[PDB]
Every structure is written in C-alpha cells, then in structure tokens.
Design a protein around this nucleic acid. Structure first.
Lengths: 247, 61, 43, 72, 105, 84
RNA sequence: UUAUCCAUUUAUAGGGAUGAAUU
RNA sequence: GAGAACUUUGAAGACUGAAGUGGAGAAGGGUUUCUUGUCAACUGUGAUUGAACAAGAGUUAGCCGCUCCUAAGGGAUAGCUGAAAAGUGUUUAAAGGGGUCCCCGUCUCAAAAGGGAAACAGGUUGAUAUUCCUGUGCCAAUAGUAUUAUGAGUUAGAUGGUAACAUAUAUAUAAAUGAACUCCUUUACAUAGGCUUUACACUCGGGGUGCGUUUUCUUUGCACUUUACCUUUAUAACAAACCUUGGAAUCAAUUUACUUGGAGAAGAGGUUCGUUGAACUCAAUUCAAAAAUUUGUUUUGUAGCAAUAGUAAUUCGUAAUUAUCCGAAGUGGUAAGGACUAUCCUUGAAAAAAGGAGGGAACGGCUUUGUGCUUUGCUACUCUUAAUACUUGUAUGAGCGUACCAACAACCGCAUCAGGUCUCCAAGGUUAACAGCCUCUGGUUAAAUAGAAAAAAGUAGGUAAGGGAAGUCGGCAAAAUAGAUCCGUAACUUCGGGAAAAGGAUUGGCUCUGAGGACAUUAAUGUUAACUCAGAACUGAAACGGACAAGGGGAAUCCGACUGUUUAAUUAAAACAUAGCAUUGUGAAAAGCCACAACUGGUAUUAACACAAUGUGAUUUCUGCCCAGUGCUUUG
RNA sequence: UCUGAUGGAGGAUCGAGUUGAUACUGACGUGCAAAUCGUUCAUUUCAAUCACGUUUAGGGGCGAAAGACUAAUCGAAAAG
C-alpha cells in the first residue's frame, strides 16, 4: 500500500516536541568534590509550572566552590517542600524530605524519587507526577541495593547513585476524569500530535492493515509477533494473554 | 427630534406596545442596584461623620 | 506595491523605457511593444 | 517655549551673547497686554506683562545689540 | 462628525500601536500613537514594586535624570521592609554563630 | 435560597455527562476550590495556582503538593521519615 | 586494563574521622 | 463640437445610508498619476470622453518605515559517512570579545503587524507632503590638547527628613569617587467578567455672528464660535502601596461583587508611583497679618507654545482693515489606563539594549634626593557642562523606498467578468442594537445599448369566494405568531432540565398621578438632574410588536449520547472524532515504536499518574460458554 | 432545612457579522461564472476565525478517514 501513520510518526516532520515554552531540561546537580566528601546546602528561590510535564519544577540556587557567584538549576519538585527551604546534597547530609542522598545511606522501607540507574546521569528514573519508589534492602557488603519501581520490578542499582528523599508532588492527577474534548485538546497541545487516535479499522484498506471490508472488522488475528517488520507491528504486540486481568 | 424628546420627558410614549427591548434590556437591574446601594451607603457615611448614629448600629444596618 | 527594492525600481524604469515607440525619422530609412494591462511583465 | 516670571532672570538672559532676536506683541484683552519673547539657540522665552508702564520701560531697557521684531 | 486614519505606517491595532485621537487648531481630528506603557521595577525578594524610582521604557529610563533612578539607602533595589528584614537577620544569625561557638567549649 | 438540591458545583456542566461521572467529579473540586490552612501563618488562605502549586494569599510563599489535595496518603510518609 | 563501548560536566580536590562567603 | 439618450455646466427628482462605489494602507499591478493635443483600432450601442493613442512633466526625510535584535526555522563552519552530487551540524575543535596573564565565546540570515533612541501645527503646487515653506522642538554622537566661563567637592569622593524618601531650577536640575568580579530589574506577554477614571464623539440651554421659510404661527429652524507636539511641563484630584503615632470583641473599616486586620485594624498626619497635562489661586502681582521671610483679600493670562494660525462674517486698491472666537451640563458610543475576581491535566516566548545594586583595585598640585618608590622646600586645587582656538585626512545627521489602484474597469480569474482578496476610522432618528428602514458629512446618477406596444410563454412577486392535504412517494414551496409585560406550564428525568413547553390576557394617541438623586443653612427652609417603572381617566369605523424586524406547535418510534469534522464542483449522515472502558509492549542507552544507503536521528528539554499500538464508544445493568482451527506467547 | 437578594460559571440558548452550504433537487445551465444569483439554512467564548512567516515533496507528504487533497489534473501529481 503506502506508508502508515504508525510509520510517519518517527520521521520527525510534525511530531517534534513543542519545545518553545519548556523552561529547561530536568536535571540534578552533578558530581564534584563536595558531594562525595560532605554536605552542600542551597535554597530554592522559586517553584514554577512546566507546561509539558505535570510535576512542577523547583528553581534551585547554588553556590560553586571555585568561582565567585551563583548557579541556577531546575529540579523535579517533590511533595511538600516550600520556597526558602534549604536543600542538602551529598553523602553526609541528614535524611529529610527533599534532600539528596546516595542510595547506600537511607534505611530500607523509605520512599524515594529521582533515582539514577547508572551513576552520574544526574537524574533518570521516577520523575512522573505523583510517583515514588522504595528501597528493599542494601547489600550485605554494600556497593549494591535493590529498589522496587512503580511498574512493579526489582532493579539493582549501585550504592554510589543519588536520589531524593520524599515523593514527587502533583499526585493523583489521573483521578479527575476529562469531560470535554477541549481539555484533551489543550493537554495534547503542548506535548505531541498523537491525538486524536482515529480507529484503525475504519481506515481505508490501504493505509492500515486493519481496515477494509464491509463490516469494519479486523479480519485476521490482532496479535502480531515481536519479530514482525515495521509495517506489521500494529495490533496487540506479542501479547502474553488477553482479557481482563486476574491479579 | 427635540419635540419628541420633550414629549419623552413628559412621559407620553412609555407604552408596553412601544417597548421592544426586554425588562433587563431597557434598564439594567445591576445598575439600578449600584445606584441604590451607593446612595444609601453615602447616607450611612454621612450618618457616621455627623456621629448621629453609633458604630455598632451602623455596622448592623 | 508602495514599497519596492532598488533593482526592482530600476528594472521598472528600464521596461518603461523599452515601452517607448520607434522614432519617426528612423522610419524614413515596432512589434515588441507591451501594454500596461494586456501583458504582465511579471517582474 | 518656556515662560519665565522672575525679571532678574530675564535681564540676565538678555545680556547673553548667544541671543539674536526679540519679539514684542500688543493685543487688546478687555487696554493692551504684551508678551516679550526672546529667541535663542536653545529655546524661546516669553513673559506676560499686564502693566503697559513696565512694558514701556523694559522694552527700552533691553540692550540694542539685538534685533527687534513686531508681528503686527 | 469626522473620520480619521492611521499615520505611522503600521495599520494594525497591535498593543504597540494604540491610538489617542485629538483635535487640531486647524479644526480636524488627527491621530497620535501614545507610547506603550511600561511595567514597574520590583524588589528582588518579594517581587513587589518599589517606590522612589520612575517606571519608564529603556530609552526613557536612560534619558531620565539621576535623581529619578534610586532611593539612597544601602541597596535601593530592595524594598525597605525586605532590607530591614535582611539587616536584623544578618546581625542575629551572626550572633547565634558566636554564642554557639562560645558554648561549644 | 438553595437554588439546587444536590448537583451543586457541577451544575455549571448542565444536563450533559452522566451522573456517575458528575457525582464522581464533584467529590474533588469541592475540596479543590475551597481554601486551605497555611502552616506558615495559620490563615486559611491557600488557594490553587496550577496543577501542583498552592499559594497563601497572606504569606505570598507557595508550596508544592498533590494534584488537588495539599496532603495525601502517598504524602503522609513524612511521619515515617521524621520518626528518626 | 589498554582494545572497544557508554555517561558526565568548565573533564575543578587520593582514600577514611528565603542574607554573603571573590583581589 | 458638423455630429450629443450614455462629454461638460445649471435646474429637478433619487440612490449609496457611515458593515458606503468615503477616506487611508498591506500583498499584487508598474506609469494606469498630472497637463497639453488626440480618434487609425478599442472603449462589444453612439461617442467630442477615457484606465486608448502622441508629446512633455511628476515621487525631496537625523524624526514615516526598512536597515537593528531575537522565533518556530534556513544556510554554512569542525568532525563523520558517501565515488560524488549530497546528508548531517559539536557527535576526540588548538575554534572571536573584554580586562589586564585571567575570564567569556560556532558564524550568519530570517518580522515593512513582535521589542524597537528621535515631531508637531498651519501654509504650499498640475501632479509630492508629518519629506517642500513658515514657525516651534526633539533624538543621537561629538577626537586630543589648550583657554576661558558655568557649577559642585577638598586641603581622597555632598547633603537634609525619626520614615516611606527627598534635595543641584546654572539659558541647560550636567557633575553626590568609584575597578576586577557577581545578582537582580526593565525590555516582557493568556482568557473571561463586571466596576471606575480620563479623553474623543454625540446631545442640551444661554450669549454673539451669518444664513433660510415666513398664506398662517414661530423669543424662530441651520452653520461657526477651535487650540497640536514640546516645557523631568508645574500643581490639584483619584485608585493602590508604604511610613509615623495610634493598640481594637459589643468585632471592626469596606466593594457592585470580597476583601483586611496584634506578621498591627480604625482615627489623625504624611511619602510615592501611575492615570491624566493648567484641574486647583496655578503664576507673579495690588492690599492686610508673621521677622534679621510665612499666612488671608484682589488684578491680569486662553499656564507658555496662542493668534501672528485657522473658521465664520463685514468693509476697502482689487493687498489691508473691521468686530466674535465664552458662563455652564447630560448621554454612554467608542479607546486607553487603574484596582480587582474567576478559569485552566491550557500558565499564556527572547534577545538586542538599558538601568540599579553587593563589592572596594587607584588616588592633590609644584620642586627635588636616591633604585614608581622614601625623602627633603610651598600651597590656592579635583570632576562636569557651554563656547572658543589649534593639530589630526574635510570632525554632524549614510543608503533605499515616498506618484497612482486597492477592484467601483487599475489584482487573479484567456476579458473593462454580478466571482475571490487582508486591517483602522464608523453620524442622527427609530430601536435591546455597529440588525432592518429613512436622513446629514463625503460619493454617484454608472454598470456590453435606448424609444415604443404590452399578447402567448418564461421569470421575481401579489391576491383570491366555499371546502381545507381530498394533490403528491412525501404538507416539497408558501400561510399561520414571531416583539415586550403579565398569568399559567404537563409526561419523564441523570433532579441539572425539558420550558419561550402546551395555553392564554395586554399593546395606539393626548391629558395627568406616584415613586426612584445630588447640592447648604441653624429638626426646619432652599438650589437642581435623568429617563424608568406602576396606576388613572378621555378618545377612535375595537385599532394600535399597525411597515421595517420575528419559533408553527404536539403524540411518537429508529439511529447517533452532546458541542465539533468531513467526500473544494452531485451524497453532511446513521460516517469519523471526542470524553469513558479495557488490552498489550517497555526499567534506557546491550530497552520499546519508528526514520535513515551509512554516519546518524525523532519520540525525548522524555521516565510507568510516561511513551507506543490498539478495539469499543456518555451514564444504568450487564459483558454467558469453547484453547479443538489458526494465530500469539512461556521452560527446555 | 425553607424564602428574598447579590454573584456572574458554562466546549449553555437566540442571533446579525465572519465561516459554510441544508432545502427550494428554485433561476442560469450557447451562463455574471470551467460552480455563479435569490430566498431559505448553519455557526458566533471556543476542538473557534483570519492574516503573514515557517516545516513536511511522489511509491512520498498530509489527513477529527470520504480513496479526500497535494496549483481546475490523483486508486500514485507535474516537466522532460
């Protein structure tokens, strides 16, 4: 037939992120001498909204140790921290809401956010609105620690990664149902152009494998193997099962 | 026009058969409320300034 | 357009110059002539 | 234009060599009023006089080295 | 009445091109474009407008006299309430450091 | 008087949308729009400003929080943190 | 650990016990 | 003019009816612009006209824009692929600025609607005007030295106020040390809602001018009676913020609306910003009261720019004189500003450039010892504006656009085609009204033709006795009220509505009654303003939302939950989409989906309340059984 | 709990304008026109409308999806 809408998506023509009003990549303060050998405390001068994500962003002030003057950074805000609160990063810092600590210090059963799956990437995991993670227990010899991610998997990360004590704010955003189409349109304004969905089965029989016929039915098994080519992966991709879940 | 407006001031064409705007269209109930509230509140201000009435009764009214 | 570039104005002058008819006394010894409305210069 | 009231200021600005021309108006108010105007590279300074006597004395007190103009 | 027309070559009513009509000694209604309004200087702490200083545009602020740009008390780009707060905070936290140091021994 | 029996704040939506989705939504905006107490001043004057930021009118000191609840069970882990 | 690959910053300290702070 | 229904002038009747064939502009057109001649062809009819033909003429900017900065972005530099054309654009980069070794750093282009240094009024010609003239300003820059002069500071940097802060008035408020290094601010931002202030517009009564009807009445009906930018323009007034004192519950002040308060309310006294740009005795002044310079009484002035300009009249050589250009108000029709409230799973851009601050590096002048430093001998000197002069290459102000049209025949539609084409201005009456309809300012009386007779037929309408859907596939076209006030309003229902349900009553003219405000005097007397409602008689061919403007309702079933979108030129739906429901894959750079010839890239400035692919389509109650078939997947 | 106010939310209602094309299967259909004219109709605080600039180039783009549109040409454009 022709190229499918599931194929044109990755070409980069109109699916580029609307980066015009984004206030800054969410990144945590990176390594230095002080972080690895003690506490360093800054303050949060302001907290703002980011049009793309849900969780707000904290504009954090810091002072360097080699050049006179300040630096600014944007952190993924966690719940219940206020403007003016002093935020401490490093190893020897006291564990409290909003602070930054290496994974080899806090006890088990403490909620956490902004993990770092490989040390130095300055913040990579658990950043969505209203989400958290929990450490299950450190290694007996150190150097390792397992954490239970929100999806429900136990991942092992070194002890020299960093994380934030507390929970990412803006929790339960999914509770309120969208009523009007306008809310959905406004929401998808500032992320992508993946909306509206448009059912595949009502497509013309040439721009989607699902379409065609006189009763708008799929006509062949919807599940498709993981080894399929680019234009074939369109259904329930290599489904392990179907139907309602049973725990 | 001037003769008709003089008759208008004398009140000769207020007929319902002549009105063609709604009750709220011909005069704003909101604006009439503003006028009423403003005149009575100014009266209360003059009352307190002359000290004819005490503050405790003033606030109640 | 009330706003024009220098080369465009000069080219319009050139075209108006071209629009001039053949002198009389030369004929004693044209066909490429446009009209302001019939043919558009396009430039 | 910049109206000036104090009279010693005007007598000072008259002596300034950068000034060229003076302007004398006469007009009927209700008698005659005058507005002594003075032209200089920066501005044009005017003065109102309800006193014909003061106008008469000041117009001749002004130095002769500058040119005089009357619009009417 | 009369009828008017734009004159400053930009015939749209964008918020940099608003109009205040006036009449002339010639007896005609002309058009003038009033300069766009500008914001006000604000304290760095409370983000609140501070007094003592004019609120012109860039060029007008440059042209303004030095007597219309600052309040003469230490900071001057900080509201008086905030500067007082900073001053006594500055003294007292230093003294707390001193007393903690002396009680350290 | 009491203009409506039970619809309340969701009467703005008119007759559209089902009751199982209007009674459901009404559970949350009632305690969203209502102002909340501020710890820093004790004045119940904290409103919402965006999806996750609350502001006290008196303090002019804003605090992050949940989508619509200033505090939530997922955010009452501060007790576990603070027992140390 | 050198090949190689990945990540990071201005490639800024060898390892253990709501104010500024530059000559 | 030989020629005139369609050239020109006058009379008359009309139209366009401020959403205009009116003014300006943009893109586009490119001399169609103006003048003098002009009829070979064209201007579908005539033609003396012309957007035709011929000959000349016409676009004046330090201030109107471009040029400047930056956006979604483009192009290119280093590297990397590719044989190359090319594709990538910091992915191992020794890659331009400043200070004085240190710090900073891809380049460039992209807006005639964003940000943006600087202008106004009158006059001016055949064709241009914020460009020319006259008059009055403003903006930017101004190299080195030497002279004067203006002002401050000192024997290396001011003051007053307890405070918010204020202070330099020289022609010109220019000068209140200040480096390296830094932190801010401005530039700089959504929508909705009402309130308030000012300006303009409109309207009203008086005064003065001129006009006009005047069988008949008419203190008459119409026009003019004006004042730009600039002077941190001065002040006054107001919305808010702040300061001082003051110290509250019998809670208090307050908005149309809620807002605020021991984190200090009210009262009282002040400070500022912003709105406006002469408000207010504002200015000096004539007169009285305070002392080695303050408060009360008056004159003048359109606060200056200002009348010398316009405008309207009147004389007079035919260029001048003449008198007026002022006591007051109401409407809300726009615009702008202000203070607020509400909404967002939407939070509503940046640099150019400028400002402020923390900080405290360097420090008079003349002469002199010695190796910029210590020194010895005297004290008037340090910074800034203005002008002048001399040396430096000539030491103020670059270039481009500027006529015309904006469709009515100057644009595209094969064309002088009823089509399409982007913004501002926006009068009176009637009225809810920027609707319709009529009129004033301006414009036109022209549309590829005119006179006559009026049949058939067509076509845009009217009207029809009695019947009232009997026609027809089908009440398709039309007819019925429709405005406003008042009365009343069911089944069902998600309790929000249905609902203007259904269904009724009133509706004109003239003459009256009542109610609805602000302002000042020692509870009482006066001054003065809207049209808004409620009622009343009297009257008419019983008619009065008199035209203009404006729902036909009801009983049901099927489909789709709704608002929305779509087959430009045969199908607007029951089709799609949407909110909701549910599934699957995915723990990150050794992952998912996808693009790419390879390098590489988007999702991603991303992280399971996220990304990608799906079917069903509010809500209610449900969502029964089969893993044999084919798929998909799990362990070896 | 019931009554009277103020208040002004709504992908709320009517409706000129803008945007479109429901019906008359009206006119013209050798037309004003290679899609127009009259009456009627739809929409108007938001999934809105327009303008300029800007990106996506053919076995491709783009599509609230009809085999639509991509210069009157589209079940594979146009020039050679």
């Amino acid at each position: 037939g022709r190229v499918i809408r599931g194929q044109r998506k990755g070409r980069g023509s109109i699916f580029k992120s609307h980066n015009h009003h984004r206030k800054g990549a969410a990144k945590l303060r990176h390594l230095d001498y002080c972080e690895k050998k003690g506490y360093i405390k800054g303050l949060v001068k302001d907290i703002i909204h980011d049009p793309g994500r849900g969780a707000p962003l904290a504009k954090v002030i810091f002072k360097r140790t080699e050049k006179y003057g300040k630096k600014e950074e944007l952190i993924i805000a966690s719940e219940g921290m206020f403007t003016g609160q002093y935020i401490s990063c490093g190893t020897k810092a006291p564990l409290s809401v909003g602070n930054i600590l290496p994974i080899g210090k806090m006890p088990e059963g403490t909620l956490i956010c902004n993990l770092e799956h490989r040390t130095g990437n300055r913040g990579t995991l658990v950043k969505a609105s209203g989400c958290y993670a929990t450490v299950v227990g450190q290694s007996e010899d150190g150097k390792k620690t397992k954490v239970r991610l929100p999806s429900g998997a136990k991942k092992t990360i070194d002890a020299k990664a960093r994380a934030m004590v507390g929970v990412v704010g803006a929790g339960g955003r999914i509770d309120k149902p969208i009523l009007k189409a306008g809310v959905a349109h406004h929401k998808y304004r500032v992320k992508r152009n993946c909306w509206p969905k448009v059912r595949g089965v009502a497509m013309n029989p040439v721009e989607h494998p699902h379409g065609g016929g006189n009763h708008q039915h799929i006509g062949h098994p919807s599940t498709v193997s993981r080894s399929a080519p680019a234009g074939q992966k369109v259904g329930l991709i290599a489904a392990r099962r179907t139907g309602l879940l049973r725990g | 026009v001037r003769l008709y407006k003089l008759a208008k001031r004398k009140g000769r064409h207020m007929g319902i058969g002549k009105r063609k705007g709604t009750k709220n269209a011909r005069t704003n109930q909101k604006t009439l409320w503003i006028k009423r509230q403003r005149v009575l509140r100014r009266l209360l201000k003059r009352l307190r300034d002359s000290k004819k009435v005490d503050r405790h009764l003033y606030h109640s009214f | 357009g009330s706003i024009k570039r220098f080369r465009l104005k000069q080219r319009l002058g050139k075209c108006r110059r071209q629009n001039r008819p053949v002198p009389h006394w030369y004929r004693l010894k044209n066909t490429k002539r446009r009209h302001w409305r019939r043919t558009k210069l396009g430039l | 234009p910049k109206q000036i009231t104090d009279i010693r200021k005007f007598l000072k600005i008259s002596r300034k060599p950068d000034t060229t021309a003076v302007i004398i108006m006469k007009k009927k108010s209700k008698t005659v009023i005058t507005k002594l105007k003075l032209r200089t590279k920066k501005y044009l300074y005017t003065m109102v006089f309800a006193d014909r006597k003061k106008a008469e004395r000041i117009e001749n007190s002004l130095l002769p080295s500058l040119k005089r103009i009357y619009y009417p | 009445a009369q009828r008017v027309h734009y004159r400053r070559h930009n015939h749209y009513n964008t918020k940099s091109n608003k109009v205040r009509p006036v009449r002339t000694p010639g007896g005609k209604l002309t058009i003038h474009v009033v300069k766009k309004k500008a914001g006000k200087p604000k304290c760095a702490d409370c983000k609140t407008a501070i007094q003592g200083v004019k609120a012109l545009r860039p060029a007008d602020n440059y042209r303004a006299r030095r007597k219309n740009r600052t309040v003469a008390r230490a900071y001057g780009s900080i509201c008086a309430r905030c500067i007082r707060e900073r001053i006594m905070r500055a003294f007292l936290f230093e003294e707390q450091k001193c007393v903690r140091q002396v009680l350290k021994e | 008087s009491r203009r409506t029996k039970k619809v309340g704040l969701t009467g703005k939506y008119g007759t559209r949308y089902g009751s199982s989705l209007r009674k459901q939504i009404k559970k949350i905006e009632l305690m969203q729009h209502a102002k909340y107490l501020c710890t820093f001043c004790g004045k119940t004057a904290t409103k919402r400003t965006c999806v996750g930021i609350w502001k006290c009118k008196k303090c002019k000191r804003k605090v992050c929080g949940g989508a619509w609840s200033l505090t939530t069970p997922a955010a009452v882990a501060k007790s576990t943190i603070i027992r140390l």
